[PDB]
Ligand binder design. Structure first.
Ligand SMILES: CCC(CC)CN(C[C@@H](O)[C@H](Cc1ccccc1)NC(=O)O[C@H]1CO[C@H]2OCC[C@H]21)S(=O)(=O)c1ccc2c(c1)OCO2
Lengths: 99, 99
């Protein structure tokens, strides 16, 4: 689809079998989701944003479907203010900025 | 143009007579720029992201040029680690997400 930006670009995603709402976030290198339960191994990591750094759990090679488009990549889980889909997955679904 | 997301979507902007680099950021409601001494009145504001909140100064009706596309709107100035162009200005230059 073509998505305008008068509203937040929120979309439904599927991860671990469960549906969620997430923000398409071209300013995020990485995908960060709010606290949730995910199967498989993970490693502790740090990520920094506008206000400082937080502790996250890094899940690699996770299946996630974004607005009907499949991706498999890294998903960080931790105290982000909102679920964000970052460039690591936006590239996988073929997302570009256009003006 | 069309901007892929393999790397950060950085572009040149012109604001307050200065050229700078800024992110085209669909996850940013507002536009936040590095500390710069703009003239005129302002109001304090707090904006939150990963890591918490930062204090910024809100200037209204600021002229910004983004890749030759002119816009005018609110700009927040503060100790942000990165300049981000938010949706308030991305809509004005006709920017969409597409996949
Ligand atoms: C609430 C949704 C986002 C937080 C997730 C909000 N951010 C915009 C993001 O695009 C920032 C924009 C950003 C980009 C680099 C550095 C600081 C901020 N990116 C970000 O935080 O990404 C992190 C996850 O991937 C990593 O790659 C970059 C940092 C990491 S933000 O910078 O904090 C921001 C910008 C304008 C705003 C605002 C919050 O409140 C209203 O106006």
């Amino acid at each position: 689809p073509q998505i305008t930006l008068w509203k937040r670009p929120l979309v439904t995603i599927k991860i671990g079998g469960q549906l969620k709402e997430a923000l398409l976030d071209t300013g995020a290198d990485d995908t960060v989701l709010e606290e949730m339960n995910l199967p498989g191994r993970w490693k502790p990591k740090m990520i920094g944003g506008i206000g400082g750094f937080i502790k996250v759990r890094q899940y690699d090679q996770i299946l996630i479907e974004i607005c009907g488009h499949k991706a498999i990549g890294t998903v960080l889980v931790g105290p982000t203010p909102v679920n964000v889909i970052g460039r690591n997955l936006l590239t996988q679904i073929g997302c570009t900025l256009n003006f």
